[PDB]
Amino acid sequence: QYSPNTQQGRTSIVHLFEWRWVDIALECERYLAPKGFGGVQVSPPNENVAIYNPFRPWWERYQPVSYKLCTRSGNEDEFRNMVTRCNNVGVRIYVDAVINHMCGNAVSAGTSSTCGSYFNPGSRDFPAVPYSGWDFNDGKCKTGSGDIENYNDATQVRDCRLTGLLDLALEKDYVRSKIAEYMNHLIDIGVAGFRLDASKHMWPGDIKAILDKLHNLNSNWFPAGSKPFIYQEVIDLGGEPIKSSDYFGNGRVTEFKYGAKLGTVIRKWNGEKMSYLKNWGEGWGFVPSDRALVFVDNHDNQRGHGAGGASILTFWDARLYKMAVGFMLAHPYGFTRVMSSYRWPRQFQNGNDVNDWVGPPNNNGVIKEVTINPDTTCGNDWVCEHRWRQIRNMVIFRNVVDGQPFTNWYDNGSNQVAFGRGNRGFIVFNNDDWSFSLTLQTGLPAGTYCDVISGDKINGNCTGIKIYVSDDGKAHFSISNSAEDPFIAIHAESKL
Ligand SMILES: CCOC(=O)/C=C/c1ccc(O)c(O)c1
Ligand SMILES: CCOC(=O)/C=C/c1ccc(O)c(O)c1
Ligand SMILES: CCOC(=O)/C=C/c1ccc(O)c(O)c1
Ligand SMILES: *[C@@H]1O[C@H](CO)[C@@H](O)[C@H](O)[C@H]1NC(C)=O
Ligand SMILES: [Ca+2]
Ligand SMILES: [Cl-]
């Protein structure tokens, strides 16, 4: 459950948030496989509630009505077509598995379902699964409301309703088996693994009993004996009784302190500075690298439903976002996930921002198509961060330096830092308020290399900055603090 099951040399996954299955299939063929992306995390593919408004909020997909594969991203035929085409070009599919709960215990304030299945939250009746009142934790939870009242309390966190969502009794083997039936149907179609939603709200032993029922991967594409990659969503910020180490036996765990701290460091909060990232990873008290799923959108779609660290980013903030993603993709700690988002307005109040009824671009309920502009960016309100040159080229950097050690760290005691990845990559960052201009030791061999942040290596030549490495691996780097991207990255495949 710890190995990503990606093709050798492909080292990251991209979350194509709410994209349609057809658009992900095309993206796998025209962009993700040619650019070496390891896989895609898709939004929940199972049937969910549809509020009566239109209003198609993003959170509707986290309220299951059944396990039929029928959502605004597409139906089962479209889902199987996407998994087949993506696996055929070596791009894996990871499903967001919503298994802790069904929909809101109320929600009947006005609602329907995405594939027409009947459901009634009040009587706990979900006949398309089938689940009844005997399959929920209403009698195990001991709070007066039935909802979680203290989110650091270990028993309420796992047995009571998360924000009113009907909580499944995962100690029953019937419930564990229905969930495994759904997840096994997905593995058999060709899925390579899963994001386990709300894992903090499930007991480690119940998750393991579900995982022990999971199938080996489809051996028409994966070697025999391969097991599904599992990454558990658990926000563990520090002193609470629930800890990420309660879940290492089941698979990887999301390290939310990674994106939170990389965000406060790049923003210099409280005097923090990038030179403190010298011992980034386990030196910062994070989970072990072989159990970490890392990302920098600490909390994307930062609406009111969220109890943790958070930082969403715009223009001067897109600059900080690209710097954070580049540091993450060059650093060897953890398995990396990049987020691809959609555009949505903000309100500018409550302290930071509050336009929160966000939902993806939609064609009257169904997700809109992803369009590609002539410069390879996207239209139709999709942001496509994974197509930004600086991010895409850092996804490639991570592949090129796969397995090489962290080495050659440099820092100026403030926010100008640099490090190498063995003899195959080197990266330099300037987040101070003055320019950087110095000769540093790399582990790279002599030659001319293209900076992949400011340009590309096209046809034996570079489109942006060129870096010259001398015979003893030293190289001069000059970075203005006024550059749009104050960092430079070079690697073995961007050498001329
Ligand atoms: C121009 C893009 O067309 C497609 O991507 C075809 C997707 C597709 C999905 C499900 C099917 O059963 C199918 O025949 C085709
Ligand atoms: C080298 C071993 O390090 C660990 O096992 C870290 C465990 C750990 C558990 C929970 C956390 O929230 C965390 O940051 C770290
Ligand atoms: C000139 C740009 O053309 C496009 O962006 C086509 C997007 C597209 C084409 C076919 C599809 O089935 C789809 O989902 C999306
Ligand atoms: C590409 O251009 C750089 C200068 O920008 C030069 O050093 C390099 O030799 C050129 N490539 C070839 C193959 O001549
Ligand atoms: Ca629970
Ligand atoms: Cl997550």
Curated annotation (Swiss-Prot):
One of its GO terms (molecular function) is alpha-amylase activity. SMART domains: Aamy (SM00642), Aamy_C (SM00632). Keywords: Calcium, Carbohydrate metabolism, Chloride, Disulfide bond, Glycoprotein, Glycosidase, Hydrolase, Metal-binding, Pyrrolidone carboxylic acid, Secreted, Signal. GO terms for biological process: carbohydrate catabolic process; carbohydrate metabolic process; polysaccharide digestion. Glycans are attached at N461. Pfam families: Alpha-amylase (PF00128), Alpha-amylase_C (PF02806). Changing R337A: Abolishes chloride binding; has only slight effect on activity. The active site is at D197 (nucleophile), E233 (proton donor). The keyword Repeat does not apply. The record marks D300 as: Transition state stabilizer. Ca(2+) binds at N100, R158, D167, H201. One of its GO terms (cellular component) is extracellular exosome. Binds 1 Ca(2+) ion per subunit. The modification Pyrrolidone carboxylic acid is found at Q1. Detected in pancreas (at protein level). Its EC number is 3.2.1.1. InterPro entries: A-amylase/branching_C, A-amylase_C, Alpha_amylase, Glyco_hydro_13_cat_dom, Glyco_hydro_b, Glycoside_hydrolase_SF. Chloride binds at R195, N298, R337. It catalyses: Endohydrolysis of (1->4)-alpha-D-glucosidic linkages in polysaccharides containing three or more (1->4)-alpha-linked D-glucose units. Its cofactor is Ca(2+); chloride. Disulfide bonds join C28-C86, C70-C115, C141-C160, C378-C384, C450-C462. PANTHER family: ALPHA-AMYLASE. Belongs to the glycosyl hydrolase 13 family. Monomer. Binds to the sea anemone inhibitor helianthamide. This is Pancreatic alpha-amylase.
